[PDB]
Amino acid sequence: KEILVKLGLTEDRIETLEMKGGIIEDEFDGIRYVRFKDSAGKLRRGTVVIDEEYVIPGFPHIKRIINLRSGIRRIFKRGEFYVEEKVDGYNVRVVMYKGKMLGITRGGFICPFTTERIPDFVPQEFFKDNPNLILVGEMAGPESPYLVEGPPYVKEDIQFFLFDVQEIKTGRSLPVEERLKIAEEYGINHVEVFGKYTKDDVDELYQLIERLSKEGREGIIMKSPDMKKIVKYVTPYANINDIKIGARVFYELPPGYFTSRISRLAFYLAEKRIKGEEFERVAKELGSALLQPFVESIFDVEQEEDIHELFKVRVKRIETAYKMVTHFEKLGLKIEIVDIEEIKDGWRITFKRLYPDATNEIRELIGGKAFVD
Amino acid sequence: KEILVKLGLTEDRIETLEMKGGIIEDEFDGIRYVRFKDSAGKLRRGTVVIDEEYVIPGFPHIKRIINLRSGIRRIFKRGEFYVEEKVDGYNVRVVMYKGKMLGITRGGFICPFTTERIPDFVPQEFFKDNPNLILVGEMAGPESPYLVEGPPYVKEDIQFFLFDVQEIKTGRSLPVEERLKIAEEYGINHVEVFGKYTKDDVDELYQLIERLSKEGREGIIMKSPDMKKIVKYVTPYANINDIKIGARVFYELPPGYFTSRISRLAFYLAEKRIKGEEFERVAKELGSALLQPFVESIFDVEQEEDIHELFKVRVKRIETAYKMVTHFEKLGLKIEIVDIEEIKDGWRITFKRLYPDATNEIRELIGGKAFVD
Numbered sequence: 001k002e003i004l005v006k007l008g009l010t011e012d013r014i015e016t017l018e019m020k021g022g023i024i025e026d027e028f029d030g031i032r033y034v035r036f037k038d039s040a041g042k043l044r045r046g047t048v049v050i051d052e053e054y055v056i057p058g059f060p061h062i063k064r065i066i067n068l069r070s071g072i073r074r075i076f077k078r079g080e081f082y083v084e085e086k087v088d089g090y091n092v093r094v095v096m097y098k099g100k101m102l103g104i105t106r107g108g109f110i111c112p113f114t115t116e117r118i119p120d121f122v123p124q125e126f127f128k129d130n131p132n133l134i135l136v137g138e139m140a141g142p143e144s145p146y147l148v149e150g151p152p153y154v155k156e157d158i159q160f161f162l163f164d165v166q167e168i169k170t171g172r173s174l175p176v177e178e179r180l181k182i183a184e185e186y187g188i189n190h191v192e193v194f195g196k197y198t199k200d201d202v203d204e205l206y207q208l209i210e211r212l213s214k215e216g217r218e219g220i221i222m223k224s225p226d227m228k229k230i231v232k233y234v235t236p237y238a239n240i241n242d243i244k245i246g247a248r249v250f251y252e253l254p255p256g257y258f259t260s261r262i263s264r265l266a267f268y269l270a271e272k273r274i275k276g277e278e279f280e281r282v283a284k285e286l287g288s289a290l291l292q293p294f295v296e297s298i299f300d301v302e303q304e305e306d307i308h309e310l311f312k313v314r315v316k317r318i319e320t321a322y323k324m325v326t327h328f329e330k331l332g333l334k335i336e337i338v339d340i341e342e343i344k345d346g347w348r349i350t351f352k353r354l355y356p357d358a359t360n361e362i363r364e365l366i367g368g369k370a371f372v373d
Numbered sequence: 374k375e376i377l378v379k380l381g382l383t384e385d386r387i388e389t390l391e392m393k394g395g396i397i398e399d400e401f402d403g404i405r406y407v408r409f410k411d412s413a414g415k416l417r418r419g420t421v422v423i424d425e426e427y428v429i430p431g432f433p434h435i436k437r438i439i440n441l442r443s444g445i446r447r448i449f450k451r452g453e454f455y456v457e458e459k460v461d462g463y464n465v466r467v468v469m470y471k472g473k474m475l476g477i478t479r480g481g482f483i484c485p486f487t488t489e490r491i492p493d494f495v496p497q498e499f500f501k502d503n504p505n506l507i508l509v510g511e512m513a514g515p516e517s518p519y520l521v522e523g524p525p526y527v528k529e530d531i532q533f534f535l536f537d538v539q540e541i542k543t544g545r546s547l548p549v550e551e552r553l554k555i556a557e558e559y560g561i562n563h564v565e566v567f568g569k570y571t572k573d574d575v576d577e578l579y580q581l582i583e584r585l586s587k588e589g590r591e592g593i594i595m596k597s598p599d600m601k602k603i604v605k606y607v608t609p610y611a612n613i614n615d616i617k618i619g620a621r622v623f624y625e626l627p628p629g630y631f632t633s634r635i636s637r638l639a640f641y642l643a644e645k646r647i648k649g650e651e652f653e654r655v656a657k658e659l660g661s662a663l664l665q666p667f668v669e670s671i672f673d674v675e676q677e678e679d680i681h682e683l684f685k686v687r688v689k690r691i692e693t694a695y696k697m698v699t700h701f702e703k704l705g706l707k708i709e710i711v712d713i714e715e716i717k718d719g720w721r722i723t724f725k726r727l728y729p730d731a732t733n734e735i736r737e738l739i740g741g742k743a744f745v746d
């Protein structure tokens with residue numbers, strides 16, 4: 001049926017797509033849609049199609065730079081660019097559909113929890129005035145369904161941070177200034193905007209990256225005002241911390257997870273020509289981030305305990321918690337542990353995530369398994 | 374022609390093999406042979422065939438253990454096992470062919486340099502007495518064509534260390550005691566043999582691993598006397614040092630190179646329950662091993678210099694140096710730099726190895742390349 005709606009754009013190559021990704025599904029309240037698992041033609045990974053008119057493009061990759069002074073000079077030759085806070089949460093695309101506000105996560109999933117929560121952060125008025133518009137933003141905070149951590153200054157459950165506004169079908173991105181007005185017009189919370197800079201501002205930008213890193217914050221995104229040039233640069237902190245987080249589940253992750261972030265550290269250290277004791281300090285922190293969580297996980301598997309973590313979320317409607325478990329099932333494996341209704345306007349829900357692979361590999365290994373490399 | 378000689382063992386699946394590995398070639402002195410690049414049937418990777426009678430089986434993988442107390446218990450339930458020095462050099466298989474002594478490296482390559490040198494370490498008498506036998510051993514030292522380092526106690530160019538004796542066609546391995554007698558009968562230098570131990574000796578084995586590690590040595594191989602049970606265990610030092618060596622060419626190596634050895638450290642640390650300051654010390658050493666060479670390689674590419682290393686070997690016959698360059702070409706890319714004839718009975722030859730990939734990736738990156746993860 002939506003196979004015709006797809007034809008309104010591409011061919012029987014839709015059939016070639018039916019092979020392994022780019023699939024059908026119903027929504028938070030039974031709103032059937034097609035999610036592009038893999039990217040075909042001009043429709044990116046994570047692209048959602050509800051109908052010919054409502055086509056929410058996938059959020060593109062954002063290129064990364066490893067050296068800050070270059071890369072900046074390379075990309076923003078002599079132009080001027082905005083520097084925004086890169087917030088560590090999860091990517092959310094927000095649309096209004098038949099009066100319903102929707103939260104589309106990166107993969108192209110209409111997510112129950114997000115969907116339920118967006119209204120708290122985005123006024124309905126916006127879409128009433130702007131049907132043709134999508135909001136893109138980071139959902140971030142201590143009580144998050146996905147990421148373990150977030151910005152240290154968000155004290156209670158999730159918060160929403162806008163960083164893009166796009167029109168539908170096209171997915172074309174509105175100018176920075178335009179998006180900032182929207183944000184202020186409608187009172188939508190927005191990623192911090194540190195200012196407009198040039199390649200000539202690399203020194204004070206170093207200073208910024210320094211502060212953010214001392215504060216345990218992710219890093220920055222650089223944007224041309226016409227939203228055509230976009231690059232990410234993460235802090236030393238993000239790199240070491242990502243390693244600390246992931247070392248606890250070492251065997252749940254591809255080796256590249258670790259080496260990539262080792263790179264990014266080396267390059268930082270090279271670029272700032274850090275040496276002597278400051279270098280030692282960083283080396284030691286790389287060591288501990290790699291070893292301690294790993295070793296603690298080993299002691300754990302050894303005490304016959306499982307590798308797990310408990311994380312919390314707040315909901316309006318308890319049945320959406322259950323809806324999450326099913327949504328998670330479309331990916332990982334989580335179970336409920338405690339409901340504290342003792343929350344105004346809802347319930348704090350504690351989930352449990354298990355890490356079978358991490359637990360099994362460590363198990364076998366400490367069990368004395370012999371293997372080939 | 375040798376296609377019939379292969380048929381004396383397998384079928385027209387030899388043709389299926391002709392696809393991508395298991396190939397023909399001539400030797401150090403034009404002795405044509407077939408090298409098994411990939412393993413088919415009962416003939417392993419690196420298996421050499423000179424003719425139906427002379428079939429040098431490939432050296433098998435040696436299984437690894439990551440936890441010492443277990444693994445030992447798992448493999449040598451209550452049995453008794455020999456503990457040999459694991460010597461960091463390169464794997465060599467030695468045969469006598471029509472009066473010629475041959476050095477077959479792991480991959481199945483008749484190696485000019487090794488071939489030229491074996492006579493210095495293995496008496497001809499041996500093969501005169503034992504035509505049906507192969508010697509397997511580690512070639513190791515400061516002036517090595519392959520590995521960068523070796524045992525710290527080998528002061529001048531390469532040395533040979535026996536660790537297996539096998540009969541031909543079968544490749545069946547002789548008992549430990551039998552190989553030790555051979556070693557002593559013919560004066561072939563052998564890997565240090567620390568003793569016979571049981572699972573009940575883990576404590577003094579820990580002490581051994583401790584000393585070896587403080588001495589910057591690889592580790593140990595454990596062998597049942599009938600050579601049927603074989604397992605490797607490397608020192609903390611080997612793990613950290615392997616990281617230090619590889620970090621300098623970080624991008625020349627698969628991420629797994631680094632993570633695997635991070636694991637092995639974690640497990641060591643867990644097993645010995647190392648904590649407090651001793652833990653800190655190891656964490657710092659992991660950090661420096663991962664960062665400092667990397668950073669120095671970055672400063673280097675940046676000073677427009679190339680990532681390279683100079684390594685030396687000694688030869689009897691100068692034309693075998695050239696022969697090496699061609700043999701290397703069958704794999705990597707090396708050039709000659711200096712000949713010091715000023716060596717009794719030959720020449721000390723300085724080679725140069727380049728690392729294009731490491732140099733190019735670092736180049737682009739410090740040049741500010743923007744990329745996707």
Ligand SMILES: Nc1ncnc2c1ncn2[C@@H]1O[C@H](COP(=O)(O)OP(=O)(O)NP(=O)(O)O)[C@@H](O)[C@H]1O
Binds near residue numbers: 061085087090138
């Ligand atoms: N101010 C911001 N502007 C744009 N994106 C932001 C901002 N703050 C946080 N982000 C998020 O940071 C993401 C890009 O950073 P990162 O998480 O490293 O990439 P990723 O999620 O791994 N996928 P990709 O960008 O395709 O490599 C975006 O996809 C957003 O979800």
Ligand SMILES: Nc1ncnc2c1ncn2[C@@H]1O[C@H](COP(=O)(O)OP(=O)(O)NP(=O)(O)O)[C@@H](O)[C@H]1O
Binds near residue numbers: 458460461463510536
């Ligand atoms: N005492 C010894 N007994 C057996 N092998 C030894 C000994 N000392 C050194 N070796 C060498 O050490 C190797 C085994 O250790 P390692 O270097 O981890 O193997 P590898 O090169 O990874 N190949 P594989 O064993 O197939 O995984 C053997 O291939 C030998 O070349």
